[PDB]
Every structure is written in C-alpha cells, then in structure tokens.
Amino acid sequence: DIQKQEVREAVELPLTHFELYKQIGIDPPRGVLMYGPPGCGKTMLAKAVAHHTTAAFIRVVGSEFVQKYLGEGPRMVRDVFRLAKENAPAIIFIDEIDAIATKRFDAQTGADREVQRILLELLNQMDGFDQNVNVKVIMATNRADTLDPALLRPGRLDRKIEFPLPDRRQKRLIFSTITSKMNLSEEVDLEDYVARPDKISGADINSICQESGMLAVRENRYIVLAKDFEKAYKTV
C-alpha cells in the first residue's frame, strides 16, 4: 500500500522506458530498501508487483551464491545484467543481504569476506554502469544494525522505507485480497481481527488465514467462521 506505493513510485517512474534519459544522464535512482519484521516479509510485495507488472523476475534466495566455486556471483551479475540491459528491463530480486552484510575478519570462515569483496566488485561495476543501461535491481533487508556505511552511500540505496508493527493498512487490504478469492461467510467479521493485531503484535496474518482454511477444510463445517480466525490467532 504505502510501501508498495513508495517502491512503485521509485521504480516505475525511472523505468518509464524513454530514451531521453541517455542524453541528460540517469537522474532518478534505481535501488530501493525495504523493511518488515513479520515472517521475513518481502514476498507478497513482489507477488503483487508480479501481478501488476507482467515482466521478468529473477527470483533468487539471499544465500544462493555461497557455493565453494565463488564464481556464481560474477556469472549471475554478468549474465543476468547483460540479459537485463540487452533483453528487457527486469526486476532482479536480490533479497536477504543481512546474512551477507555482516563484517568478517578471520580467513577461516572468510567466505563472507570474499563475497563482500565480490560485492565490492559489482559495487564498482554498478558505478561504471550508471549510464546507458536498462536495469532495475531491488535490494531490501529486515535489520538496521548489521548494515555497513558502504551500502548506505548515496546513489546506491536512496530510499529507506520503514515498516510499522500493526500496519493496519496492509492487514485490512490483505484481508480484502484474501477474501476476494477464497470463500467467506456472513458471520466473518474483521473488526476485532484487525483491531486486536494493533494491540498485540504478530506476523504472517495471511498464513494465519491459511491456517484457518486448514482448520476449515476439516469437512466437519461447510463454511469457515470466526472461531478459526481467533483460534488461529491464539495458536499461531
């Protein structure tokens, strides 16, 4: 809503697909940072972006290039960046940089230091590739303590979106988008089931609705009710 609103305004406006940026330079940024202390979040957002923007999406985990060959990184930025600037403007989902953004000194487990030196390699490549390229690389995280001042340099991560704990907007609209497809009842009410998460903190409300569907697929009851919503709240 507001998070996808700031991301959308920060993505689709620079990616308006016009050649006039190449003459006067790439003024608008391309990197956007996100947040969210639910169950790692950052998934249904890119799902909604996939619903709206019917384009390519490089879905990769945050720990995909940790292979002992150490060459997967340069091969993915080389091949994926060349097919992004050459084939079509895509959205490369390089998420979960908190596990690969921690400082490391000892050379025993210094593989994280080697892949952060690869992060320095592509860190200079993206500086050399600031002109004449149709690329949009998103990069988010869920921790603000293990970050380094190198990534926070202007021109790389120019957006710092925060996420509230209750965040009643995404909860109400996620109830609307989960009730717009799945079945529903007239007794089903969202008043205390969106007001109570404002008083008590939680996560994965959509997955709690899916747990209510698990407690409703028991075939003992034909239509899901509120007892599985509140019971799913107290259980998970």
Add this chain to the structure above:
Amino acid sequence: GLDNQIQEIKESVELPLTHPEYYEEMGIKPPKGVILYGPPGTGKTLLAKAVANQTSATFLRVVGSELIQKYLGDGPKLVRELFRVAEEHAPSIVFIDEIDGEREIQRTMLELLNQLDGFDSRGDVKVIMATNRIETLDPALIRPGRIDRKIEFPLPDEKTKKRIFQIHTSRMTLADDVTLDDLIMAKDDLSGADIKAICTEAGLMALRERRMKVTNEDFKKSKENVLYKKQEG
C-alpha cells in the same frame, strides 16, 4: 550527613595495618572490607572516599568493566593478573569500580566471587567493590563478599552538596549569585567533582572573558552539562 559514615568506614577499613594496635589485640578480624554503593553513585562516595582514604595507604585502581565487554569474554584472566599483582601488593586496598550475554557475566561473576572470596588465601588485604545500583547485583554476592559492613549513603540534598560545596569552596575563590535550588532539585547521579567541575568550568569560563564574576545564565549553561550527563549514561 557523612561524618558517622566516614568515621565508620574510617574505623572499618583503617583499623588494619595503618595504626594496627587496635586490630590484632581484641581478636575480631573482619578482613573482608566493605562494598561501596551510593544511590547517586558515579564518583560521589566512590571518589569522595577514594580520595579521602588516601591519607596514608596504597591505592589500587580498577574502574569500568569495558575491557571485558568490548571484546571476547577473556573473563577472570585479568582478575588473576590483578590477584598476583595484588598478591605482590598485599598491604594495599583493592578498589573495584563501575561494575556494570548474561550467561557469561554470571560465570565470570561466579568465578570473580570465588577468587575474590579468598578461596586460596587468608584475610590479608581489604577488598572494596563499587557500583551505581546495589539492586542490579545478584544477592548471591552479599553473603560471601560482605561479612564486615555495607554502607548506605543517606544524603540530605541541601547539606551534602552545601557542606561539601562550602568546605570545598572555603579555601579557594569563586563567584557570586551561585544558586542552589536548581542544584539540589535537578542534579542526580553525579559526584562532588562534578559540582567542583562546573564551578571550575564556570569560573574558568568567566576566565575566558577575563572576568572573576559568573552570571546566572552562565551557571545554567554550565548546569546544562549536568542536565545532559545524567541523561546520557
């Protein structure tokens, strides 16, 4: 109100070798020392008694637990260093100050209590522990450590800093219009070297302009240092 407290710690920790004939004749021997704790703390009773006891003695400075928490949990190795140099400095006074995850603090505090209790030596040196809040320390430290005496500081806010301010400003010079209501009403968790520090930076701040008088707004500007010092840490 600290005369009875300073004569009770004077008789408590100055009964040993310094004027010793009243300690090894009656046969009491509480050779464990006291554990300093002050409701304001932060060098007030710690520094006041740390400089007041230095009339004739040997002082041993141990301030802050940063060297333990700033890196890996080295633990009681530096306690063994201070215990072998305290063994080579037996007629001294062990002064541990600023005693401020928990799974290791409890085991280095357990080993600290074990080595500090005198598990391998008899009573020969006076060990003094210090902290800001006596409630954060686990009560398991009181029985082995404190068997001699524990001192509370019931300070009258007007006469503690007005008596210490009067004595400490009766020999040196100062300025006029030095208020006290905002001092006794606002200051907390600070020392006497802090009121002396703001009178010294107050008269010194007036000395920057080459003046001997301090304005009330300048004493509030120096007071702001006290206002933020208690809110920072």
Add this chain to the structure above:
Amino acid sequence: LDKQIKEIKEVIELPVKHPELFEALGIAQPKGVLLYGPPGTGKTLLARAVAHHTDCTFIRVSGSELVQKFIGEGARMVRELFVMAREHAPSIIFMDERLEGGSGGDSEVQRTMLELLNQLDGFEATKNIKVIMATNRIDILDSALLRPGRIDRKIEFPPPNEEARLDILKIHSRKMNLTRGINLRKIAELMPGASGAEVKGVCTEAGMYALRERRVHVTQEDFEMAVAKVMQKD
C-alpha cells in the same frame, strides 16, 4: 569556483611547489580549516578535485562501528591512523563523521579533532597530513567556543548565499543540454533555503518534467517548477 580555490591553494597546494627547505626556512604546514555552511555542494568536490589533482589517498576517521576495530585493535583512534599516515604520507583527511545531545555526542568528534590538531600542532613526523573541519549546526558556534583560533584557516563557505549556486548551477548545466533563453540571475539568485544540494534536486527533479513534457532540452520554466519542488520540503 575561484574564491574557494584561491583560498585553498595556500592550504593544500602550499606543500606542493615548496621543497623540504621551506620546512626549516619558511612556514612549516597549515594546520586546519573549517567551512561553515550546510553541505549542499563542494563538500567532497573540493577535496576530491584537489585530491584528484594531487593523486593522494583519502582516509577517514568516522568514529563509529565497523571502523573502531579495523583501525587497530584498541587505541585512542589517533595513533594507528597516524601509523598509517607515516606509512601513507599523502593523505587528506575530512572530519565528517542541538547543544544538548550534540554537545557530547559531537564533542567526541570535537575531542578527536582537538587531539588531531594537537598532534599536528604537537609534532611533524611526516608531511601532507591535513584535516578539514565540517560542522554545520549549533556545534559550529560551540566549536567556535572550542576552536582556539590561533591555528585555523578561515575560508568562506556560501551555501547561505547565491553565487555558490550560480557557479555550481553552471557546472551542473555544462553536462546536460540547456536552452539559450534562460536567465540564471533570478532562477539562481532567487533560490534560498536548505543548502546547495537543492540545485541538484532542481536538475534531477527537473528531468522528470523535461521528459514529462518531451522537451529534448531544459528550459527555465522547468527550473521554476523544480524550484517549487525543492521548496515543497525543508
């Protein structure tokens, strides 16, 4: 861009055209300099332009996490960087990283530059070691209460003026295409507010209206709309 280089040539360029005999016959070294004014433009373009014409290194202190352990295991943070300053003689240092919280929290950096100017003013084991003060809050009047003034260069930094937006608006106008029916005196002298970075906000935020209106070049009306945009916030 002349009133700042004319005052910085004697601060950075002085040990360039002077051999080692001037260390025992003339002025040894300039100690420090501070530029009061919000870092809109020239915060790193001056030290990076002269350093670009010096080919030295750029070592920062920036007392925070991830740097207190890299520069030595444990010290006062002004001795290990000085060992790296004897090993690396050409090094330009830039001090970059309320009166209530900033007095102490910024007084850590104030103490850092006090002991750095007391090591430079103390002894000279190596040359080309210079520090630049950058404070643009109440702590520049508190810094003025802490700066002794005896060893200090005074270079005017105009973000609260207009010429520093005229010259940097022309520099930011040479890279992109601009029209000929433009007057930089009203659109460049009539831009007060936060700092000189809202000019870069006028160019970057003006590109949205230049591409929005399909203008192949940049006009003055676009700069006016971008002036409104940069005047929306701050």
Add this chain to the structure above:
Amino acid sequence: NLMVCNLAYSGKLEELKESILADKSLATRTDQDSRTALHWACSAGHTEIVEFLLQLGVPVNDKDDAGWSPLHIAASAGRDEIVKALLGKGAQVNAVNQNGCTPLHYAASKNRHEIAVMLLEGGANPDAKDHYEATAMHRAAAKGNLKMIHILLYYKASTNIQDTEGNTPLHLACDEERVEEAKLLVSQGASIYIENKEEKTPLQVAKGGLGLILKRMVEG
C-alpha cells in the same frame, strides 16, 4: 452438514417449502453448530425462505454455541430485505454475541446506510460497547465511511468513546489518516486532549502535522 444446510444453502425453494409443510422437524432441525434453517437461509441470502420462516414465526432469539443471533449474522451480511424482515418481526436490536458487538457495528462495518437507519430507528443503542469497549464510531470512522459517520451524526452518536486501550474514534481516525473524517469529528466535539495507555495525544498519533490542523479546527 445436515439436509437443511444444502437445501438452505444450495438454493432450494420448493423442496425446502415442501420440507417444512411436510414435517416440522426439518423446519426445527438443529446441527452441531446450534443453527436452524434461518441461519443458513440468511447465509445463502434466501429472501422468500426467511419470509416463510418469519411468517410462520420462527424464534429469532435462537443463538449458536457462541451467541450469534440471526440479526447479528444477517446484519453482518448487509442484505436489505433480510434486515427489513428481521426488523419487521422486531428482533433483539441490542443482544450480545460472543464478542459483544451489537448489530450497529455490523450495519456500520458494511457501509449499509438503510440497515443503520432502520436499526437505529427501532431503538438500537447508538453508543453501545462490546467486550473490547469500542463503539461503532471507532470502526465506522476507522474503515473510512464518511456517510456512515454523517448518519451517525443524525442519531447523535458520541465521538469520545474510550477504547479498551484508551483510544477514541479520533485516534482510530488519525491512525488511519482520515483527513476529512478527523476534521468532521473534531468539528463535532472530538477532544484532542484525551490520552490512551500509550501516553500520546491525537496530535502525536497523526502523521504529517495533521494534529496541528485538527487543533486549528478546535480553536477555529
């Protein structure tokens, strides 16, 4: 799970009317959920079926294992003719369900204007509270229904109800950033000085300086 669930859910008119006229046991058959053909017929939106049931005089006070009367559930459906027949019979307009939410919270939740005018017209409490101590203006003003707020202003609804946390409808309007609704409620008597358990006034709960223009709407 019973027969009246598929006959009262899958759209059976003449088989259900013949099932009632043939044997009253099917008409008074209850399942494990403690529901009759009125609950399932109101669940599927059956108009003529509930007109026949309410015509014969089915007990409307029948609740489930939680306490959900067909007026809370069918008023939570937002159907026009169903609530017209239920209020035509004169059901309990202020009965308590499992959470305590009166049918006014359900008429205000679904933005049903006629159901709110007809519930509040028959004697329903305009400021009734549930177990969560919240009224229909917390949720009606929080969801973003301005016309529901206006027709609550027609029935003299209070604007400073304390929630179980201590919030007011102005706190649930500033938290949702409803500009015109907070300006209306403030222009109706919403106190900007009420504090919840978080020790925060509605000026601090709103974002973007909205409490300053709400204070402007207080002093002017």
